[PDB]
Amino acid sequence: SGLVMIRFEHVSKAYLGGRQALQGVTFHMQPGEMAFLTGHSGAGKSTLLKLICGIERPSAGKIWFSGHDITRLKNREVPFLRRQIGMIFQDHHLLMDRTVYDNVAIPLIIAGASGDDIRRRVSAALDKVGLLDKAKNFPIQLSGGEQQRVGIARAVVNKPAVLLADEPTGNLDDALSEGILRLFEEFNRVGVTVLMATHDINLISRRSYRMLTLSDGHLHGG
Amino acid sequence: NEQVRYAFHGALQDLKSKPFATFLTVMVIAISLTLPSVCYMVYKNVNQA
């Protein structure tokens, strides 16, 4: 239609062991669409989310991020692809030896930003997730559903064009999982697509978002 | 043409499935023609005599 943010054509991903993680995945996602990527355990859910970030390269087909083809993206341009992609995993990748403030301020230092610029954005980002007045404590002494809230805060910093959630809230309570999902909806409202991959049954059943149902590497059925 | 081979196989395996009842029925069908046959023989032999 317009400028499809994410677009697969005939993407396949066969690993060095000779087994098929994906087979003929074809879909596109509009700039603002929120979708769920469900499927069983052995289906290429996190494999699909890996190709978007450029962590892994497809064995066939093509991938279009924004307007640029990233099928054979050069290794020099990869770090600038992931700067527009927010990445949240099942577990937080927090650096537990360092304060939350700097642990959230990492992406701005990566891109290169003023010291005072960093102060303003991380304070705002720590406020949208509702975790201000927590910037001085270390990740170890925050509670379990509170470390993940920083992981979203780190991702949302630098205004990513897309959040890729790889089974978030997999080790979170049902009451906490809904809160995280209301957070993702908060970002999706303004301008940013979401591709939350998940296993939860009562989380996708309460929302009317597009569901992508991977099954042995085959992507969409409905 | 291959259809009339499962036909023969099924019919034969059905007749052999219950040999008790099968033998009983072929016996009682044998009786029902036996006497007509023998009475035709006593028809022809007295006709010749």
Binding site: - | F8, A30, L33
Partner: protein, 50 residues
């Protein structure tokens, strides 16, 4: 049960009218043959009395 399954799968009306047709024809032929053999042996046994 086999007839019902065959009809459901899509067996024609002539497929079901077959094992039986051949079964009945074979049964009649075998019965007539056995009956004739028994009649012949019994008349030849009564030949001893005659």
């Amino acid at each position: 049960d086999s007839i019902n399954v065959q009809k459901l799968i899509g067996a024609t009306d002539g497929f079901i009218l077959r094992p039986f047709l051949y079964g009945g024809a074979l049964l009649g032929f075998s019965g007539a043959l056995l009956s004739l053999i028994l009649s012949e042996i019994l008349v030849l046994r009564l030949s001893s009395a005659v």
